[PDB]
C-alpha cells in the first residue's frame, strides 16, 4: 500500500506515512496575484544551461524524469532570491486527465494543463541527498503549460515516451537541451515550500515563472499514455499526478515584477 494518486493512496492519505504533509511550508500553493508583494531587491534569474548534459529518461511510477550529469557545474541556476549555485539534476512534469487540470500551483485559482519542474540542488551541500535535509537545499523552477501551438523543443521528449511506458523502464536520452522549454520572459514569483511528492521535505525555494509555454493537444496526449504500473501488471494510466494546493500559512509570495 505505497503512496500514489489513487482513491485509496492519494494526497489526502500521505500524512499517515509522512506527517510533514501537514507542515508549515508545504507546496503547492495558490498564487494570489493581488496579495503577492513586488520586491525590488529580487535580482533577475541567471540560467546557465548551455553545457547541460542529459543522460537518461526514467518512468519512476509517479512521473518520468529526465536526468542530468550533476557531477560538475554544467547546468546551473543562480540569482533571483538564491545565494550560491544550484545544479540541475532532473526535470519532470505533472499533468491531468483533461486539459482543464494538471498543474500543482494555481494562479488566482486558475489551473493549467501541466507543470514542469526543473530541480536544482545547492552545491554547498555536496550532493542531492544532503541538500534535501536543508531549508535552502533545493531550488525548483516551475513552468506552466497551456494547450495551444506546439513546443518544438518538447518533441524529443514526447517521441521517447513509448519506450518507458511502465514503471522502472529507462532509456538513454543524451544531447537534450533544456533551453528549448523556457518561456521568453523570466519574470517570476517566489516562496519557501516543499517537495510536492513524498518525502515532502521542506527544503525548496520555489521559483514559478509568470509566462506559461504552449504545447499542442497532441503533445500532452502522449503524456497520458504512460502507466503508473509495472510491465505485466494491470494497466493504470499515468494521469492526474498532481497534489492539490496547500494552506499558505505564515508565508508571503514575492514577485520580481509589477
Left (φ > 0), alpha (ψ -120 to 50) or beta: where does 177 sit?
beta
Set of cell numbers at residue 195: 517537495
Judged by CB, which is closer to Zn ion: 34, or 197? 197
Q: Which residue is nearest to Zn ion (CB)?
A: 117
Q: Work out the angle at residue 252's Cα, subtended by the Cα atoms of residues 249 and 258, and round it to the nearest 5 degrees.
A: 145
CB of 113 to Zn ion, least distance (A): 15
Catalytically annotated residue among 1, 13, 62, 105: 62
**Exposed / middle / buried, residue 37 (Cβ in 10 Å: 0-12, 13-18, 19+):** exposed
CA dihedral 242, 248, 249, 252 (to 10 degrees): 150
CB of 200 to Zn ion, least distance (A): 12
Judged by CB, which is closer to Zn ion: 39, or 198? 198
CB of 40 to Zn ion, least distance (A): 30
* Cα separation, 238 vs 225, whole angstroms: 7
114-133 residues in contact with Zn ion (CB under 5 A) are 117
120 labeled part of a ligand binding site: no
Determine contact, residues 37/59, Cβ cutoff 8 Å: no
* Binding residue count for Zn ion, defined by CB under 5 A: 1
92 labeled part of a ligand binding site: yes
Set of cell numbers at residue 21: 504533509
> Is 8 a catalytic site residue?
no
Set of cell numbers at residue 77: 541556476
13 labeled part of a ligand binding site: no
Determine contact, residues 116/63, Cβ cutoff 8 Å: no
Judged by CB, which is closer to Zn ion: 104, or 136? 104
159-198 residues in contact with Zn ion (CB under 5 A) are none
* Cα separation, 112 vs 101, whole angstroms: 6
CB of 232 to Zn ion, least distance (A): 27
Q: Is 62 in the site for Zn ion (CB under 5 A)?
A: no
Enzyme catalytic residues: 62
Q: Detail the residues annotated as belonging to a binding site.
A: 92, 94, 117, 196-197
Binding site residues, Zn ion, CB under 5 A: 117
Which residues sit in the known binding site for Zn(2+)? 92, 94, 117
Residues tagged in the binding site annotation for substrate: 196-197
Amino acid at each position: 500500500h505505497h503512496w500514489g494518486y489513487g482513491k485509496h493512496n492519494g494526497p489526502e492519505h500521505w500524512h499517515k506515512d509522512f506527517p510533514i504533509a501537514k507542515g508549515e511550508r508545504q507546496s503547492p500553493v495558490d498564487i494570489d496575484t493581488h496579495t503577492a508583494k513586488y520586491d525590488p531587491s529580487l535580482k533577475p534569474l541567471s540560467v546557465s544551461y548551455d553545457q547541460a548534459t542529459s543522460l537518461r529518461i526514467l518512468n519512476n511510477g509517479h512521473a518520468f524524469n529526465v536526468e542530468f550529469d550533476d557531477s560538475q557545474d554544467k547546468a546551473v541556476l543562480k540569482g533571483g532570491p538564491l545565494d550560491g549555485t544550484y545544479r540541475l539534476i532532473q526535470f519532470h512534469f505533472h499533468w491531468g486527465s483533461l486539459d482543464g487540470q494538471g498543474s500543482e500551483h494555481t494562479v488566482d485559482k486558475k489551473k493549467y494543463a501541466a507543470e514542469l519542474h526543473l530541480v536544482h540542488w545547492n552545491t554547498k551541500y555536496g550532493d542531492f541527498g544532503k541538500a534535501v535535509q536543508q531549508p535552502d537545499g533545493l531550488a525548483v523552477l516551475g513552468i506552466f503549460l497551456k494547450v495551444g501551438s506546439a513546443k518544438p523543443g518538447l518533441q524529443k521528449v514526447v517521441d521517447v515516451l513509448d519506450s518507458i511506458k511502465t514503471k522502472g523502464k529507462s532509456a538513454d536520452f543524451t544531447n537534450f537541451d533544456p533551453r528549448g522549454l523556457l518561456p521568453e520572459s523570466l519574470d517570476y514569483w517566489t516562496y519557501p515550500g516543499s517537495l510536492t511528492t513524498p518525502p515532502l521535505l521542506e527544503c525548496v525555494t520555489w521559483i514559478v515563472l509568470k509566462e506559461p509555454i504552449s504545447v499542442s493537444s497532441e503533445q500532452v496526449l502522449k503524456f497520458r499514455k504512460l502507466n503508473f504500473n509495472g510491465e505485466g501488471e494491470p494497466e493504470e494510466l499515468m494521469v492526474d499526478n498532481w497534489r492539490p494546493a496547500q494552506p499558505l500559512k505564515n508565508r508571503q509570495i514575492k514577485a520580481s515584477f509589477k
